[PDB]
Amino acid sequence: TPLVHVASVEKGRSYEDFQKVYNAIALKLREDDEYDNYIGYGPVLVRLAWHTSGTWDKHDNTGGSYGGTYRFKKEFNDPSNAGLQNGFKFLEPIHKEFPWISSGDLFSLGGVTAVQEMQGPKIPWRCGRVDTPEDTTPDNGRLPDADKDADYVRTFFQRLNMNDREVVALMGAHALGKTHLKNSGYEGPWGAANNVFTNEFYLNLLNEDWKLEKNDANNEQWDSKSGYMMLPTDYSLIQDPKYLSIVKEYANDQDKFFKDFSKAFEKLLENGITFPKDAPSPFIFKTLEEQGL
Ligand code: HEM
């Protein structure tokens, strides 16, 4: 037995309404450019979308993006979510201007908007997540640990119904942003263009010279002399031969990575949700640049 969560469109809303919310998110991303030593909010909004979706458990349909339960203190204060409060704060004035959007739609849309405005692939997005009460908040401990190996990673993502290609594609979002010692016990960026969505994660895995070192929090991480880092779970993608093949494919085909990531990311964000046969089709929002805005 799993719960059923049926998508229900915010009353009377359509594509145009959500493009306006997209636009407000994108404009604030542009405006608040100084955040995190001028990386900007794009990376933390992508991580917020993934962590608010990544609690899902296919076996009983608990967790997931539908209920928007990050707004409750058990989930806000999950140690795995340390740092995401910055993303939530960013989204607060968006929610105040557009109070009709559900929290789950806002957290997932923030992720879509971030990826597209950082020049990533289009991510089709569906509305209709509905806020659920505090007691539906999943317990802490459903997001992955970083200090583990490929077997861990593979098994972990089975709970989110992701296969090896989906796992490797999703991990490419680590092109974005950085680890912050005070949030996670790890420090450093994975690459140079921290706020541009590219296949750089895979090129860096394959092409940098990596050394297993201890950081200031006494945790192991792989460091390169270009000043990049990889988590043990990131590095596992080149230690496992099946993952490694996929890493090589994405390192050598930007388009393929973009298409696979778009599919897996939408999937991640939609897991657990039942869409009525007559629900609207997925929206594909225009970027500001495409709109001349
Ligand atoms: C084995 C799975 C994964 C693990 C262990 C993991 C672990 C981490 C850790 C420890 C950080 C740094 C948090 C910081 O200190 O602020 C991080 C950052 C980040 N992660 Fe992951 N991650 C994984 C999967 C993913 C996936 C699936 C995505 C999205 C598709 C994602 C997107 C990000 C983003 C964009 C950031 C940078 C946030 C920022 O700069 O604020 N991660 N991740």
From Swiss-Prot:
Q: What is its EC number?
A: 1.11.1.5
Which residues get modified to Phosphotyrosine?
Y152
The name of this protein is Cytochrome c peroxidase, mitochondrial
Q: What class of enzyme is it?
A: oxidoreductase
Biological function = Destroys radicals which are normally produced within the cells and which are toxic to biological systems.
Q: Where does heme b bind?
A: H174
Q: Which gene encodes it?
A: CCP1
Q: Where is this site: Transition state stabilizer?
A: R47
Q: Which UniProt keywords apply?
A: Heme, Hydrogen peroxide, Iron, Metal-binding, Mitochondrion, Organic radical, Oxidoreductase, Peroxidase, Phosphoprotein, Transit peptide
The cofactors required by this protein are:
heme b
Included range, full protein: 69 to 361 of 361
Q: Which family does it belong to?
A: Belongs to the peroxidase family. Cytochrome c peroxidase subfamily.
Q: Does the keyword Transit peptide apply?
A: yes
Summarize the subunit comment. Answer: Forms a one-to-one complex with cytochrome c.
Query: Which reaction is the catalytic activity of this chain?
Result: 2 Fe(II)-[cytochrome c] + H2O2 + 2 H(+) = 2 Fe(III)-[cytochrome c] + 2 H2O
The question of whether Phosphoprotein is a record keyword is answered with yes
**Miscellaneous comment in the UniProt entry for this protein:** Present with 6730 molecules/cell in log phase SD medium.
Q: How is it modified after translation?
A: CCP1 precursor is processed by the rhomboid protease PCP1, which cleaves the N-terminal hydrophobic transit peptide. The m-AAA protease (composed of YTA12/RCA1 and YTA10/AFG3) is required for CCP1 maturation: m-AAA protease promotes membrane dislocation of the CCP1 transmembrane segment within the transit peptide to ensure the correct positioning of CCP1 within the membrane bilayer, allowing intramembrane cleavage by PCP1.
Q: Could you tell me which species this protein originates from?
A: Saccharomyces cerevisiae (strain ATCC 204508 / S288c)
Coiled-coil intervals in this record? none
**Active site per database record:** H51, W190
The record's subcellular locations are: Mitochondrion matrix; Mitochondrion intermembrane space
A single GO molecular-function term is: metal ion binding
Q: Name one GO biological process term.
A: hydrogen peroxide catabolic process
